[PDB]
Amino acid sequence: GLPVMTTPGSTQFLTSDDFQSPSAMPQFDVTPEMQIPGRVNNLMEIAEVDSVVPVNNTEDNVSSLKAYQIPVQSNSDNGKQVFGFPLQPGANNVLNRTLLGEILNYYTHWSGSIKLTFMFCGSAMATGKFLLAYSPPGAGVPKNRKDAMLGTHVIWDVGLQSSCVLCVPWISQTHYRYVVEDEYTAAGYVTCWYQTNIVVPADVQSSCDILCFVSACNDFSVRMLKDTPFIRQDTFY
Amino acid sequence: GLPVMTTPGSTQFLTSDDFQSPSAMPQFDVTPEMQIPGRVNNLMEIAEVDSVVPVNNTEDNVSSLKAYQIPVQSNSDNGKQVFGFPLQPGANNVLNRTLLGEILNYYTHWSGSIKLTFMFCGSAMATGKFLLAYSPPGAGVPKNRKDAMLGTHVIWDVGLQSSCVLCVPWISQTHYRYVVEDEYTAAGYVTCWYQTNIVVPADVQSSCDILCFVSACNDFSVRMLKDTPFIRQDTFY
Amino acid sequence: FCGSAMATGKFLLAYSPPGAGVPKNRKDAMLGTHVIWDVGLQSSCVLCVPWISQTHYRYV
Amino acid sequence: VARVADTISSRPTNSESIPALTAAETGHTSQVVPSDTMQTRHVKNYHSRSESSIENFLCRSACVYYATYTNNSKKGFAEWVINTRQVAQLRRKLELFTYLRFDLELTFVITSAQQPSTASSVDAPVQTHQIMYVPPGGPVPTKVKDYAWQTSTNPSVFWTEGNAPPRMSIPFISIGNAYSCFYDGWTQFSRNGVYGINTLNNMGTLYMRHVNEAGQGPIKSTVRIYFKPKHVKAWVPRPPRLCQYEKQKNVNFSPIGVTTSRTDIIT
Amino acid sequence: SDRVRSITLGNSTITTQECANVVVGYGVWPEYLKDNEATAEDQPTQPDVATCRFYTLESVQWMKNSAGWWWKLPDALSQMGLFGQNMQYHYLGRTGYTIHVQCNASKFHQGCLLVVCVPEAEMGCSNLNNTPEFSELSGGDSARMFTDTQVGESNAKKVQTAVWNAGMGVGVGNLTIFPHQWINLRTNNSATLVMPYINSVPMDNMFRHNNLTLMIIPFVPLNYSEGSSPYVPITVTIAPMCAEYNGLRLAS
Amino acid sequence: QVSTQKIHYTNINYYKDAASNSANRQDFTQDPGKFTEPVKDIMVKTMPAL
Amino acid sequence: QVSTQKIHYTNINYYKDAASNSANRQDFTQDPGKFTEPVKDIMVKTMPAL
Amino acid sequence: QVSTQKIHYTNINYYKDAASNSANRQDFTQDPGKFTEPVKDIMVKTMPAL
Amino acid sequence: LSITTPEEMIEKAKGETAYLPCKFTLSPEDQGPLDIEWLISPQVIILYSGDKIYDDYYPDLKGRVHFTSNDLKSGDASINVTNLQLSDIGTYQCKVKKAPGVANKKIHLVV
Amino acid sequence: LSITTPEEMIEKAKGETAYLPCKFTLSPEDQGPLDIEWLISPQVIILYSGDKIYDDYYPDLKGRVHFTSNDLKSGDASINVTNLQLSDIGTYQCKVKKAPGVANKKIHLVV
């Protein structure tokens, strides 16, 4: 006849509690496990994997494979802008459906730096140079090559190799950032300008393309798990 | 006044729980046990015991003792089929009411190999040879002796001894198999062909019979206990 | 390959031991012994036919 | 502790070791850290990746299916085959992997609702529900007033209102070594019939019914079922489902663009 | 150097002067079945030279307006000699493949490919009620192809071959999480993957379960100026490794 | 039995099974070396990939 | 008192009887040698039965 | 675990977090030397402030 | 339960025999009694309840329909429609109900 | 939700264009569908529900009002009132309702 007292919080069903429970089938012997290859152990072994970014939406290149091709042609004037998009890896309509996006859309607070691998999938005799700049927020978007080379930037050269990994650093006042579209914690902008024109020999196409990947560095993290706003349902299947 | 909290799962009656309980009659002294012979300790001491298989149903040899006699007579042509039945030891209408069947019909997942003892209960001057084949699934049933001797088979000879134990091996992708009639986990077929004809001297009957037993090897096991689909009831007795 | 300097390609050098006829489709000859030659900086590939015969010698 | 790696200081170099340029053809993702393309300060990092693990991502209960059954009617009782394909907020979390292995923790939240009775002075006592679990192959009941309910050795639970919701635990019940959330290939050796159907993940049914009788006025109830995958291990990750589900059996869909669109490539 | 490789198996050899590194599955190398994991009750057979070699599938043309191609893996070698012959008489069997795809072009063309090997690729039908039949889901060492237009609805048993969804209802960009390599006609010439046995049971039948799928999706389409060769073919050559079977039976 | 938390905390197992214990929540181990770099020859960061 | 499960688990007896303890569930012992081979002379496998 | 009260008292932690423990109620420490005398040179009581 | 093709289009000529197949397999979780129906939407036309056939329901089709197989409990619900006419255009529903599963087949016949 | 100025006084001359601005920002806890209203108290005059405009509600003002921006989901609810007259004195309420937030703006127009 031990004396006990029932504290508030009894006879409730918390959705995310961890308690023991009586077994339904006792002495069930499960089948022994097998060393199946490819064992994930933390969802941050998926943010490390590159995935192409649909950065050419344009409302008609979306329902096709053209959304991933970035137009790069032999310009006449120097210092033109190739692309540009704000960096909100959970709210932007570009980094949303990438492999990083559907991992971020389950959490709310993230951190760490992001890499951006580019790959010149053009001809074999063509060269050129591009300026990948990342301007932290506070002002507007940069509008002239003279403006964007003030921020953080790499001057990419195309040669034997076919890539250059602009890693956006983690420059923010707070230890985290929201994944929803906010204004208090903006994360800047990403641009990419012609350093020098795209020159080609004769009998070679002047319309080349570029693909762009995205991933996380080795200091990424998330927090405050929630559910995704993408998948709806009205009745059962 | 210890503080406690009541977790979900209280004031419920789980049908298969194991808890202590207050005694109804305290200090009851039971009568001392007696070394009664024949103590079973695990229902896998019953699957080891042979039991004849009703493998001659034929819709009229069922309501008699003829269901267990396998017709074997002195044929004229060579290479005839004696019997044949699929091997689903919980769903087939042949291995169902054997002693293995009413042990399997309480569980759902089984494993291990099965032996099949045959016994030529014929005359004393008659000889012959039979080919007991077990064709794993994937194709249809074998239809010619040339086809069934491709699988696993023993070539039985009748002499002084009067038995031959075809042991079907355990050849299956999964660690278990369902006892209900399924298609994803079929277990093959069992056939038995004339190797050579059944010859007899004069003044001896040419119509002999054969009985067939069934049992489990020493690596049998079951799991996931349920109730049998055989016994019904509408009101109490 | 004594061709040009910008041209590439790949060839399948197959040696089918006897017993059947000559192979007549690429699907047939890649069943025997074969190398899949690629042309690049180097300009050669040495298919070595092995010694596969029942007798210790062969007539000329 | 699962701490993330800190960042080390750097100085402005001028050398032949270029960490930036690499070859993405090799299928080998980059491995650079910001300390290799700019000047960084030695920042101790205390962030932790604990709340992103597998057991912190999956071990959270989620409604699966819910049925209703009236009291004052013949065969008023609910059946349900056990499968996670039906609700989509949980289906998508289980498609991120191909071969899962977990034991379960069910939970039933049973409620009642008084129906439009017609007599006068209706008053009913507390109710008692039964939730019977039939393994795959057992005998199934046909009506409420049946003798497969009591005289049975299946696992069932008896629960009455006004108390905590019932809960039982189910171990890893399968024929293989992992549940398969995908299975490409037919189920008949002749390659006919249904396409993506597998015996590997079957778990039986669930029969529920009232225990009281019809006193004076019908009572429709409702039961909600909640999963909780514990001890989970995942294998062979998979991209997340994009197109909207349409059926519970297969993975049919209608094609839809990759992302929502913007007005111009530079905005 | 660091650009050349020389792969040999059985009695066949593959040599490439210009290529990138080789990607090896999920980090494991294909080997036989240990006896802690074995489930068959009998002893398996191991040809080991009669099957472990490079079979060459049929060729495909890379037109400018191409969409893609896919092969169902332990189904495409159904007719290639001793492998297909041992795949019939037995009942179980495990393998591990060494896929190699090769498409060469000059220095004046442009293009790119994504050579991915998606495991357990389940595809969706054109009609939401039905499921794709066998004839239009795979072909004996023949390449079924994607499309750039959404397949209509009045078709009864067909595959939805809209490429921007990879047929599986998943976004086509996120496919890189599986082992893959890029055929890039600028610097690359050949892509090669080494895929172990990935399945939830130690062995399985091979006529009912295509436990892999080799897809090829041209991201940057082929393009060239007038004068260069207008015909650029692709050829994939697959080679089993560490194969073994169980459970003899009749032909089927 | 007694272990640390996110000080200490005490846990006792009551039932006689394994699928009845509470969630683990504390298997902190990762190894992306099989998804990021699944190549045969080691790739050094500084030196070029070719 | 403390024993292993299908790690460890703790059990304590409260009442002062024997028919009040919980089920055993852990008497794993078998001996089919009295149902399979109930014969007087030992039967060896290889040599014939006669 | 066991500590004194306002005799002794026993406390045991059950859950595996840190925000689940009860209130502390026993952090008795003060230091007004940063609000009362926030000056650079020390000020002695007896001697005048100038 | 599962039907191989939940809906399709069939075309036959007037005066021929119309084959409207209905195949299925049985998952392990199905152990109840068998029930097979057949509908028409220009109304039951044939039943199979309790292993016995009841098939005098549609006066327009008397004897003009009957099951094909002799193993109706194995996955065969097909019907043999004979002597096709012009008043036989309409959608058919092969409704099979084995506890606790259910599956249908929408055969839209056009002539 | 939050409006920059919940109420102010505006003065324009008869025959000019009247600018009645309505700006807002979006807190993180707002994720529902968008709704924007406009009232008048001398009665809805224009709606924005489901990303589509419904604006034939006030017979006295037909075509004399229309939104300005082309990014109405970014924080612009302003209306372009043209050709001011004398019967247009009254308080306006810019009622925007995004789940689960709500914010108003009381524009008292005098002429």
Task: Supply database-style keywords.
part of a larger assembly; 10 chains; D: 267 residues; mainly beta; four-stranded antiparallel beta sheet; three-stranded antiparallel beta sheet; 10 strands; I: 111 residues; 13 strands; globular; Genome polyprotein (chain E); virus entry into host cell (chain D); Viral_coat (chain D); capsid protein (chain D); virion (chain D)
Your description of this structure?
This is part of a larger assembly, with three copies of chain A, one copy of chain D (267 residues), one copy of chain E (252 residues), three copies of chain F (50 residues) and two copies of chain I (111 residues). Chain A has helices at 101-104, 145-148, and strands at residues 4-6, 39-40, 70-73, 81-86, 109-111, 114-120, 127-135, 152-157, 164-168, 177-178, 189-199, 207-212, 215-216, 221-223. Chain A is mostly beta strands and 237 residues long. In chain A, the strands form three sheets. In chain A, strands 3, 6, 9, 12 and 13 form a five-stranded antiparallel β-sheet that branches. Chain A has a four-stranded antiparallel β-sheet with strand order 4-11-7-8, with no helix packed on it. Chain A has a three-stranded antiparallel β-sheet with strand order 10-5-14, with no helix packed on it. Chain A is elongated. In chain A, 46% of the residues are buried. Chain D has 267 residues and is mainly beta. Chain D has one domain. Chain D is 4% helix and 24% strand. Chain D contains two helices and ten strands. In chain D, strands 2, 6, 7 and 10 form a four-stranded antiparallel β-sheet that branches. Chain E is mainly beta. Chain E has one domain (5-246): Jelly Rolls, CATH 2.60.120. Chain E has two helices and twelve strands; from the N terminus they run E-E-E-E-H-H-E-E-E-E-E-E-E-E. In chain E, strands 3, 5, 9, 11 and 12 form a five-stranded antiparallel β-sheet that branches. In chain E, strands 7-4-10-6-8 form a five-stranded antiparallel β-sheet. Chain E has a two-stranded antiparallel ribbon with strand order 1-2. With 111 residues, chain I is mainly beta. Chain I has one domain (1-111). Chain I is built from no helices and 13 strands. Chain I has strands at residues 2-3, 7-11, 18-20, 24-25, 35-36, 39-41, 47-49, 52-54, 79-81, 90-93, 96-98, 101-103, 106-110. In chain I, a hairpin with a 2-residue loop joins strand 7 (47-49) and strand 8. Chain I starts with a strand and ends with a strand. Strand 2 of chain A pairs antiparallel with strand 10 of chain D, so a sheet runs across the interface.
